[PDB]
C-alpha cells in the first residue's frame, strides 16, 4: 500500500478487454513529507480519481482483486481517494 | 515483524469496500536503539492505534499491517520504551 | 503498469507451449519525461503491437493472468496500445506527433 | 532459515488474537562468523527462547505454519534454539556459553 | 522476460536439467551476469534463450530458444 | 532454485517437531562460477550433504513441499548435490 498523486492519464483505444472501460492514470509516488518524488507508473482506476488528487495504490494480486477479480490484467490499482493527511497534529494535505 | 511509531493518519471516505472500516496510518520504523529512524511507510490498522503510539507491523495483505499495540520494549537488559 | 516503446521482436520456433503463437516483443521503458530509458525487456504480445508503438505493460502474476491463466510462462505482457499520454497538464505523447 | 540472537522482549496487551499468549521476541541476525548483523526484527516465540540465546528463525508463509498454521499473521517464527554452530571446520558458538 | 546465452550445465544425479546462463544486454552482448535456470525445453550450450522470472508451475526458467532478434530494423542475432 | 556451498552445521536439540530429525546446515549463496553472493543462511537437509559440497536449494512454500509436507516449518531446502558444473566442456566443479 502506497500513497501517490494523479499527474495525468493514458488513452489506449486498443486495449485488453479485461480492462472494461476503467480509466488508466499516470501516478507519482509521494515522499513522507507529502511531496512528489520520481516513482511514476500507471494504475487502473474505477472510483473516479481526478488529476491532482492524492490516492492509495495497491499492487500485485491485491490489485487484481481490488479491481474486479483474480482475472483483472493489472498490477497497480487505486483503492481510495485521500481527503486529507495529518502528521504532527497538523494537516499536511487536504482535498480542495 | 517490525516496530513502528504512529506519525500520522490518512483519511479516505471514498475507498474499496474490501478495506472496511480499517484506518490508514503513517508509520515510522524504530531502530534497535529505540529511536524512530527515517524509513517511513503506510500501514493498515483495524485495532485502533493512536498518534504517537508504538505498534507491531507485519507483511500481509496493502503490505504493512498492525497486529499489536506496544506497551513496552526491553533490549539488552534496558527498557528502551514504555507506554505512558 | 508502465509505458514502453517497441524496439523490435524475438523469434522462438521452439518455445514453451503456454505461449501459443503470440509474438515476443522487445520493449524499452519510458521515463516521465516521455523519453525511453535504457531499461529493456521482452514482452509477450497478442494485441498486434508493432515496432515504434507505445504500449502499456503489466508484469508478475498479473502478467500471466493478462496473457491467459496462471500457467502462462510470462512475466511481462502488453495489455494495451497507447494513443496519447497526458501528464502534468501537458501532452507528452500522441499517436500522431 | 537464519540464525539470530534474542536481544529482548516486547509486550502487547492489545494484540491480534492469532498471536495468542505467545511471546514477542526482539532479534538481531548473525553473520556466517558469529558477529550479530545490523539487520533486526521481531519474531514470535512458542518454544521458549530466553534473552541472549541463539535461535533459528523461519520467515514468510512458512513462519505461519511454524507458529500454528495459515491462520496466524506472523512472518517470523522461532523454530529452534541453537545448541552449537560449526562453520568452516570451526566451532563459532556453543550453547554452554 | 529477458535474453540470455547458455554458457554451462549443472548435473545432479543424487529429466529437467539446470543450465548456466549469462544475460544479454539490449545491444546483443552478454552483460557478464551469470545465473542458474531450469530447462525443460532442451537448450544446449551456446544457444540464446528466453528466460522468464518467478516461473512457478522456480526463479529463472527457459521458455524459448532464440532463432533471431531484431532491434532498430537491424538483425542483431540469428541462429 | 539457487546454488550454494555447505559452509558448516547447526545443532538444535530443542527444535520444532515438524523439522523431523534432519540436519541443519550452513549454506552460502554462490553463482555457477563459485563466486559467493555474500548472502548466507541455514537450510534443512534430508539428503546427505557434507561440509564443502555444492548443493541446489529451494526456498519459499516450495521448500516445505520439498521437505515433507505443508506442515513443515521451513523456508530453505536442499534438493540435490551437484556432481559437476561444466562450461564449454570445462569442469568448473566436480563432486568428490
From Swiss-Prot, chains A, F:
Q: Which InterPro entries match?
A: EutN_CcmL, EutN_CcmL_sf
Superkingdom assignment: Bacteria
Pathway connected to this protein: Amine and polyamine degradation; ethanolamine degradation
Does Repressor count among this protein's keywords? no
| Record localization | Bacterial microcompartment
One GO term under biological process is:
ethanolamine catabolic process
The record's CDD domains line, in alphabetical order, gives: EutN_CcmL (cd01614)
What are the residue boundaries of the BMV domain, all occurrences included? Answer: 1-83
Alphabetical GO CC annotations of the entry are: bacterial microcompartment
Which Gene3D superfamilies does this entry report, sorted A to Z? EutN/Ccml (2.40.50.220)
Q: What are the alphabetically sorted keywords of the record?
A: Bacterial microcompartment
Under the subunit heading, UniProt states: Homopentamer with a small central pore.
Family indicated by similarity: Belongs to the CcmL/EutN family.
Which function does this protein serve?
Answer: Probably forms vertices in the bacterial microcompartment (BMC) dedicated to ethanolamine degradation. It may be involved in transporting positively charged molecules into and out of the BMC.
Q: Protein name, please?
A: Bacterial microcompartment shell vertex protein EutN
Q: What is the species listed in this Swiss-Prot or TrEMBL entry?
A: Escherichia coli O6:H1 (strain CFT073 / ATCC 700928 / UPEC)
UniProtKB/Swiss-Prot annotation, chain E:
- Which PROSITE patterns has this protein been placed in? BMV (PS51932)
Where, per UniProt, does this protein localize?
A: Bacterial microcompartment
Which Gene Ontology BP annotations are present? ethanolamine catabolic process
**Pfam families recorded:** EutN_CcmL
Q: Which UniProt keywords apply?
A: Bacterial microcompartment
* Domain BMV span(s) in chain numbering: 1-67
GO cellular component terms, A-Z: bacterial microcompartment
Pathway the protein acts in? Amine and polyamine degradation; ethanolamine degradation
What is said about its interaction partners and assembly? Answer: Homopentamer with a small central pore.
Q: What does the UniProt record say this protein does? A: Probably forms vertices in the bacterial microcompartment (BMC) dedicated to ethanolamine degradation. It may be involved in transporting positively charged molecules into and out of the BMC.
Question: Per the similarity annotation, which family is this?
Answer: Belongs to the CcmL/EutN family.
Query: What is the name of the protein in this document?
Result: Bacterial microcompartment shell vertex protein EutN
What is the originating organism of this protein? Escherichia coli O6:H1 (strain CFT073 / ATCC 700928 / UPEC)
Amino acid at each position: 500500500m502506497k500513497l501517490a498523486v494523479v499527474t495525468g492519464q493514458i488513452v489506449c483505444t486498443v486495449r485488453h478487454h479485461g480492462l472494461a472501460h476503467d480509466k488508466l492514470l499516470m501516478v507519482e509516488m509521494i515522499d513522507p513529507q507529502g511531496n512528489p518524488d520520481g516513482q511514476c507508473a500507471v494504475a487502473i482506476d474505477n472510483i473516479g480519481a481526478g488529476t491532482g488528487e492524492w490516492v492509495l495504490l495497491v499492487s500485485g494480486s491485491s490489485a487484481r482483486q481490488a479491481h474486479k477479480s483474480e482475472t483483472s490484467p493489472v498490477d497497480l490499482c487505486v483503492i481510495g481517494i485521500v481527503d486529507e493527511v495529518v502528521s504532527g497534529g497538523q494537516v499536511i494535505f487536504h482535498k480542495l
